[PDB]
């Protein structure tokens, strides 16, 4: 059970990142889980399964990152709440 496919990686990543932020108030830790996963997407899809994942969920995940980056400048936690609304939508669809 090593998470190799993108939906597997995002599912375990979003679970862990939410546990850090909502469970433990650890914004830094949340970002340390998420930033690498977004960077993986930004490298681009390499396989067919990555391509179809990207077509389904790429826009939503990209927008969640923009809300997080809004938070980085604003400091307004409501912007992280927006991001988590988008991340939860992805999480349910890949569960």
């Amino acid at each position: 059970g090593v998470a190799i496919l993108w939906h597997e990686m995002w599912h375990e990543g979003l679970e862990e990142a939410s546990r850090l932020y909502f469970g433990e108030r650890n914004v830094k830790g949340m970002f340390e889980v998420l930033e690498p996963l977004h960077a993986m997407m930004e490298r681009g899809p390499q396989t067919l399964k990555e391509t179809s994942f990207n077509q389904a969920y790429g826009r939503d995940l990209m927008e969640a990152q923009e809300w997080c980056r809004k938070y980085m400048k604003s400091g307004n936690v409501k912007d992280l709440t927006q991001a988590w609304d988008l991340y939860y939508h992805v999480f349910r669809r890949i569960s």
């Binding site: 108030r25 307004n76 936690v77 409501k78």
Partner: peptide, 13 residues
């Protein structure tokens, strides 16, 4: 509050 977010709360909400 002990059945919701308690002493820590949920910062900024």
């Amino acid at each position: 509050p002990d059945y919701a977010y308690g002493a820590t709360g949920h910062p900024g909400i």
